[PDB]
Write an enzyme that holds these catalytic residues in place. Structure first.
Site, PDB file in Angstrom:
ATOM      1  CE1 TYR A  91      72.188  17.868  21.956  1.00 26.89           C
ATOM      2  CE2 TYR A  91      71.079  18.400  23.563  1.00 26.89           C
ATOM      3  CZ  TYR A  91      71.554  18.601  22.319  1.00 26.89           C
ATOM      4  OH  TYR A  91      70.300  19.080  21.698  1.00 26.89           O
ATOM      5  CB  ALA A 109      68.579  24.994  18.913  1.00 23.19           C
ATOM      6  CD  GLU A 110      69.850  19.138  18.037  1.00 23.08           C
ATOM      7  OE1 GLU A 110      70.090  19.793  16.806  1.00 23.08           O
ATOM      8  OE2 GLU A 110      71.001  19.858  18.886  1.00 23.08           O
ATOM      9  CB  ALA A 111      62.083  22.057  16.549  1.00 29.91           C
TER      10      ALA A 111
END
EC number: 3.2.2.22
Length: 255
Positions: A121, A176-178
């Protein structure tokens, strides 16, 4: 590789939720039960099926994202340039040329290009050139309409690093994060299909995926933690209060 499609020409909240469950069901090992909870757990690494393809289908074109099945980390993306020719961009320590050909067979070898920055990130955010607040991904917001606007920055366009980076930050969080955090999925569906503000809580969940998975895997009994835990947004003692969607693979439960 296996491929799932998200229709952004005629979006709906129910279809977005179904899309995320297809990702969770594809990579999980149903025989793994962590901490006596019902949360899905990613299975052990495999060499017979290493990647997963996700298609963002729009009215004026389709842009695709590739993820690694063993951890959901990003490996590459596909998009047409200003001449309408398909090109692929990849992180070299994640996939090879032959594997990329099997993943995106519409891109010839000569049009496969290595990305010049890392997939962490921090590195992606620097190239995004955000100029307000703390200048991190949080300042961009989240939502279906935002994903649509960012896709326009790469679909049928000459490549611009700034726009590419902003697209990756939103695409990764919306997939991916959800999949990992139902708290994030729920914010997207409650506000559907609008763009909306992100929160400190969203970022705190993301940086704590390994710590949360570790606590449930080895310090939790029938859904109850053996001691209090705080991941940034408050004290928690019940695993269910974290609303998890997918846990990191750490091996098989002992005993």
């Amino acid at each position: 590789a296996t491929a799932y499609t998200l229709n952004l020409a005629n979006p709906s909240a129910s279809q977005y939720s179904s899309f995320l469950d297809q990702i969770r069901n594809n990579v999980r090992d149903t025989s793994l039960i962590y901490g006596g909870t019902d949360v899905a757990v990613i299975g052990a690494p495999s060499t017979t099926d290493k990647f997963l393809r996700l298609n963002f289908q729009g009215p004026r074109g389709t842009v695709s994202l590739g993820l690694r099945r063993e951890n959901l980390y990003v490996v590459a993306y596909l998009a047409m340039d200003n001449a309408n020719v398909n090109r692929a961009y990849y992180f070299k320590n994640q996939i090879t040329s032959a594997e990329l050909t099997a993943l995106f067979p519409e891109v010839v070898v000569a049009n496969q290009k290595q990305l010049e920055y890392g997939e962490d990130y921090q590195a992606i955010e620097k190239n995004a050139k955000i100029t307000t607040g703390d200048q991190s991904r949080k300042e961009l917001g989240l939502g279906i309409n935002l994903l649509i606007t960012m896709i326009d920055g790469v679909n049928k366009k000459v490549r611009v690093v700034k726009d590419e980076a902003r697209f990756l930050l939103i695409a990764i969080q919306m997939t991916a994060e959800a999949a990992r955090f139902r708290y994030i999925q729920n914010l997207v569906t409650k506000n559907f299909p609008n763009k909306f503000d992100s929160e400190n809580k969203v970022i705190q969940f993301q940086v704590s995926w390994s710590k949360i998975s570790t606590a449930i895997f080895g310090d939790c009994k029938n859904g109850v933690f053996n001691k209090d835990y705080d991941f940034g947004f408050g004290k928690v003692r019940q695993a269910k209060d974290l609303q998890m969607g997918l846990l990191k693979y750490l091996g098989r439960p002992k005993s």
